[PDB]
Design a protein around this ligand. Structure first.
Ligand SMILES: Cc1cc2nc3c(=O)[nH]c(=O)nc-3n(C[C@H](O)[C@H](O)[C@H](O)COP(=O)(O)OP(=O)(O)OC[C@H]3O[C@@H](n4cnc5c(N)ncnc54)[C@H](O)[C@@H]3O)c2cc1C
Ligand SMILES: Cc1cc2nc3c(=O)[nH]c(=O)nc-3n(C[C@H](O)[C@H](O)[C@H](O)COP(=O)(O)OP(=O)(O)OC[C@H]3O[C@@H](n4cnc5c(N)ncnc54)[C@H](O)[C@@H]3O)c2cc1C
Ligand SMILES: [Cl-]
Ligand SMILES: [Cl-]
Ligand SMILES: [Cl-]
Ligand SMILES: [Cl-]
Lengths: 462, 462
């Protein structure tokens, strides 16, 4: 009947979060209404940043060999992401349900208590905790935790119940998709017909009219409908209730962004909520999940709507495609768009300074220490802070030592770095558990103890 | 009853063309149905390239002091054109009718025979000439010329009569504009209301609903309606019949492009048609007006429709504005868009080579010769070819001399040039009468006699 945190939903947000919470030592119970995984695999593949956030927790061997691609697009306009370092890491084909499967197995292995066939019906936040009414296999009962995170999808029960505001615009049309056998081991169709208002046969009629080709004879594996409703909560947290994934942001599924943003909500949240449970941090840390991820979510609605207009509008939008195509020929444009599609652009407010990596993801950096060959990616496996002492400076090691219960201080000779990476001439980096750079030397206005304090809390009492 | 060329229309296309034809020594008769200039001034200002094509004919003193601005925009998104060299030359406020007035006076001074209150009713092209039925002050009569150029506006009588194909898309909505006194020497309004189907009072109703402010009490100077019909002729010439201006391309009036493109159609055409009349060139030269200017016209429909979508669509297009705004922060994007709005981007196919100016406009270049201080702009005043011998190379002077009846060969020490201008390390430039670079050394694949031949025709018989 207890846990430190209750997570509602075992989609990719919920499973990632459960795992992250376990890495922070948190007792976590996940509540999922479905008895089994649906096996749909509506999304295909994942972004280079998602691949990186899997990698930094050692999750990748679970997938085996993964096909990658630099061939991306923005609203249908094709171009090469190769122009942006690290964009090569995008997984091309993995179905959503395989990804979910691995994250479930990962999080379960770490000790997450996942209760399937348990539906959350209602909830009460009373300042000291959250209590949920749940229907399980045994019928109605209650559970209680310090915190409750709604990872329960587009039509979130938690969002509805805790009184979150969810402004934005209602659905305007309807698309269709189908898993089908016959003509071209089943191939997918993408049915986006002109002017469909908000049986599988109608899905055929929508294909014969759009392309001229007849397919009313195909075996229907999966058939589904979806909108272009675009909404985001004004608050990611109301007291002891938190949201991550679709529960916080819905949009047209354009340019492969939803699962990726939701998994990455969970990666921002886990370590922060864990610090809070463990008592090493205050709710100030917790607020940075709202500000950081509301900002990201806002950008996701922009991204997907902008692509949707380019994809779904008639020939009237062609002059815009044409202009944008011309712009895409410029390196800076290509990279900007690749930055946005990949998620590699993501930059949190961590204070000012000239260091080009502040607030951005720490890119993969090879490291030789005194006792081992390792990498920044490797050192992130346990979801602790990582301070890289790149120029054998022992003063640095002593300034940070009061946070060494929470931050690994690593002295290493760094590998070769690219001009564009941001790592040239860098003598030190403080990396947050989610991989984001809190501070670097030289070129941070804020000092190292401020950064350590801001993300990890009070120093140890000597 | 005769002339070498008959021009139909004394809008800015017709007046510029008349002038250009006079500079080539051509007997030109302009036929204009209106008795006086309407005085509307629907367009305000003109582009930096228009300013340059006026400048290169010494037309500018007619305007006196002209206010210029680097503050431009693309579909409402404001930014600084200063990033592109020469974009500063955009005239900010001059009304269309002042500009027309000066071009009329300029062309009349050069000997253009302009017949006002003469309307073209019909025409016949019979392989050796064109004959028009015209109603004048004396009633119906006929005129004949070697060529006929329709510069007769959006609803072109010439285009209709000579059987030009005019594909594209019909008008979709309707806007309004008004010259008005009262609140804020009369100020203009811009009325673009949501969902108006294809009296001045309705123009007031369209202002009170759009802004919330009431103005049903204002004195109506000028009041007009216009569409977003977007069409372009597939042929700029059918035999001995030619089109320039709106007669060839109609579009939404977005981002100040129409008059500018039409004046510039006339600048491309005049010298070519003149060479043809004078017998120094063949109809091959004349075809390059079609190819060069159809291409430009096609780009104009793209430009204006793309801006219109950004201007006139609801909030649904805001994510696109936002993305585009972000892109505009990049120099290359800013310049590209400035290139397109200013017209400075315009580049004709003149053959290949590495020289960065091939086919582009020759930028203003100061020149010291043996007998005078001058400029490339100055040398273009008489609409002849100009070959700049920038490194005292007498072999060059002799290779071109067989075209010196048609091409001024000028030996000069060039002034300081910018890195981005395209003139660094350039030893020679062949400039066409419209200001476009046909050939330059080093870095042209084609040789100088080929270029001379292609634009000026047969060499002189020694
Ligand atoms: C056609 C289509 C294509 C897509 N393609 C892509 C793509 O290419 N790339 C991409 O990144 N994203 C894509 N998405 C979005 C993606 O599918 C993600 O699942 C979604 O964006 C985020 O998942 P989530 O974990 O937050 O929520 P969900 O995946 O919706 O999971 C929420 C879970 O909560 C459970 N639940 C709900 N209510 C309760 C309750 N009261 N009690 C207990 N449990 C509950 C549900 O059963 C569900 O399993 C696509 C979506 C669609 C429709
Ligand atoms: C509201 C508005 C704002 C605009 N703003 C701008 C702007 O900011 N910048 C810009 O560059 N452009 C702008 N334009 C376009 C611009 O007004 C130009 O005049 C047009 O783009 C090109 O002019 P033209 O000489 O080809 O034809 P026109 O100006 O239409 O002149 C054609 C002439 O032919 C005459 N004619 C027609 N039929 C016959 C016949 N049978 N016989 C004899 N004569 C005939 C007509 O009387 C007319 O004078 C705007 C247009 C509108 C409506
Ligand atoms: Cl998506
Ligand atoms: Cl090792
Ligand atoms: Cl225009
Ligand atoms: Cl002089």
């Amino acid at each position: 009947s207890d846990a430190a945190v209750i997570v509602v939903g075992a989609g990719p947000a919920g499973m990632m979060l459960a795992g992250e919470l376990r890495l922070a030592g948190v007792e976590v119970v996940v509540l999922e209404r479905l008895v089994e995984r649906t096996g749909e695999s509506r999304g295909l593949g994942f972004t280079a940043r998602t691949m990186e956030v899997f990698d930094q927790r050692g999750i990748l061997p679970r997938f085996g060999e993964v096909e990658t691609s630099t061939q991306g697009h923005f609203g249908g306009l094709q171009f090469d992401f190769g122009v942006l370092e690290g964009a090569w890491q995008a997984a091309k084909t993995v179905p959503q349900s395989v990804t979910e499967t691995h994250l479930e197995q990962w999080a379960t292995g770490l000790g997450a208590d996942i209760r399937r066939g348990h539906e959350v019906l209602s909830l009460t936040d009373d300042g000291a905790g959250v209590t949920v009414e749940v229907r399980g296999p045994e019928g109605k009962h209650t559970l209680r935790a310090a915190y409750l995170v709604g990872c329960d999808g587009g039509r979130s029960s938690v969002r509805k119940a805790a009184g979150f505001d969810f402004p934005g615009t209602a659905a305007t049309m309807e698309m269709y998709l189908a898993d089908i056998k016959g003509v071209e081991g089943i191939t997918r169709i993408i049915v986006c017909e002109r002017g469909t208002p908000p049986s599988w046969h109608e899905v055929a009629d929508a294909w014969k009219r759009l392309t001229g080709d007849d397919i009313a004879h195909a075996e229907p594996v999966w058939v589904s409908a979806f909108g272009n409703a675009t909404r985001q909560v004004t608050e990611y947290r109301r007291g002891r209730v938190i949201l991550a994934g679709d529960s916080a942001h819905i949009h047209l599924p354009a340019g492969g962004q939803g699962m990726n943003t939701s998994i990455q909500d969970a990666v921002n949240l886990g370590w922060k909520l864990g610090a809070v449970v463990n008592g090493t941090a205050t709710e100030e840390l917790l607020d940075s999940y709202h500000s950081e991820r509301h900002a990201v979510g806002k950008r996701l609605l922009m991204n997907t709507q902008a692509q949707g207009l380019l994809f779904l509008s008639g020939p009237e939008v062609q002059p815009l495609r044409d202009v944008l195509t011309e712009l895409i020929q410029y390196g800076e444009v290509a990279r900007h768009l690749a930055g946005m599609v990949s998620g590699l652009e993501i930059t949190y407010d961590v204070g000012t300074g000239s260091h080009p990596l502040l607030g951005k993801r720490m890119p993969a950096l090879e490291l030789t220490t005194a006792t081992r060959e390792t990498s920044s990616t490797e050192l992130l496996h346990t979801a602790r802070g990582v301070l890289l002492d790149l120029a054998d400076n022992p003063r640095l090691r002593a300034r940070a030592a009061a946070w060494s219960d929470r931050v690994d201080i690593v002295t290493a000779v760094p590998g070769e770095v690219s001009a564009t990476s941001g790592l040239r001439d860098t003598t030190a980096v403080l990396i947050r558990p989610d991989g984001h750079v809190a501070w670097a030397a030289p070129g941070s206005h804020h000092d190292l103890p401020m950064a350590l304090e801001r993300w990890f809390g009070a120093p140890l009492t000597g």
